Each structure stands twice: as C-alpha cells, then as structure tokens.
C-alpha cells in the first residue's frame with residue numbers, strides 16, 4: 001500500500017530473541033534516540049522511515065515484533081508480505097545466536113521466498129563480553145543467504161548501514 005508522495009512502500013520486520021535489542025534498534029533508526037532504562041512492551045507496532053535510494057522515495061514501514069510468545073501466532077502473521085527482515089542476535093549472548101536458525105526457519109515458513117534478510121550482531125559495543133565472533137555470524141549468514149553486519153543500537157554504530165543495505169538488496173532482487 002503506497003502512500004501518496006512515495007514511490008514504494010517496503011514492510012520490514014525486526015525479529016530475534018528477547019533482549020537482543022530489537023525495540024532499541026528501531027528507536028535508534030526511527031527516532032535517533034536510546035532509552036537507558038527498562039521500557040514496558042505492550043504489543044507489536046511499527047515506525048516509519050523514508051530512504052532515498054535508486055532515485056526513488058521509499059517509505060519503510062518497520063515493525064517491532066515486541067516480546068517473546070508462548071504460541072507464535074501473532075508476530076508471524078506480519079511476516080506475510082514483508083520485503084525484508086533484520087534477524088538480530090546479541091554478540092554477548094550465545095543463546096541468541098544459537099536461535100538464529102530457528103528464526104530463519106520462521107522467515108521461510110511465513111514469508112514469500114524473495115523476502116531479504118540481514119543478520120545483525122547487535123551490541124557490538126560489548127567487546128568485553130563478546131562470545132560470538134563476527135566470523136561465526138558471517139559464516140552463518142553466508143550459509144543461510146543473508147547479508148551481515150555487527151551494529152550497536154546503543155552507540156549508533158551501523159544502524160543506518162544495516163537498513164540501507166537491506167533496502168539495496170530488496171531493490172536488486174525486485175529487478176531480477
């Protein structure tokens with residue numbers, strides 16, 4: 001659904017384990033802010049951003065999938081029609097990285113095959129607590145057909161780069 005004034009509208013979703021930084025990543029990208037305190041989760045919602053790429057004005061409708069679910073019945077409805085995903089883990093939390101394949105399986109189950117994915121090792125500022133080497137993220141991203149970046153919502157490292165790369169690969173696939 002393209003709004004007047006835009007050339008495209010791409011739905012993007014942030015997915016991954018609880019506490020990897022999804023809500024923070026979206027808050028940094030959309031509002032260029034960070035909250036150093038616990039914020040309550042009250043449900044799934046989106047924020048918008050405009051990107052100018054490939055000579056077009058692109059509206060991004062970017063969905064935060066909110067908290068963990070007991071029954072994965074609500075988040076997964078929003079995967080339908082998504083042009084892209086940020087599949088996020090925390091470089092300081094091994095379990096969040098071990099979960100990547102499960103999230104990737106969900107992408108394939110609930111979204112069309114041409115949905116694009118960037119694997120994001122968030123919290124790259126936490127080098128003192130790193131447990132997931134970037135090379136391990138890159139290897140898995142290559143295995144699964146995803147782009148890859150390390151980033152930090154907290155320090156505003158590679159947040160723009162992640163979204164812009166995702167928009168680029170979406171545009172490339174669209175022109176196949």
Ligand SMILES: Nc1nc2c(ncn2[C@@H]2O[C@H](COP(=O)(O)OP(=O)(O)O)[C@@H](O)[C@H]2O)c(=O)[nH]1
Pocket residue numbers: 016017018019020021022023024025035036037066122123124125126151152153154155
């Ligand atoms: N050190 C660090 N902490 C972060 C970063 N991004 C988010 N956090 C923190 O990680 C916790 C979980 O973030 P949140 O965005 O709520 O994660 P979500 O459960 O995936 O939505 C919060 O305490 C955030 O402040 C980051 O880039 N670096």
Ligand SMILES: [Mg+2]
Pocket residue numbers: 022023024041066067
């Ligand atoms: Mg959240």
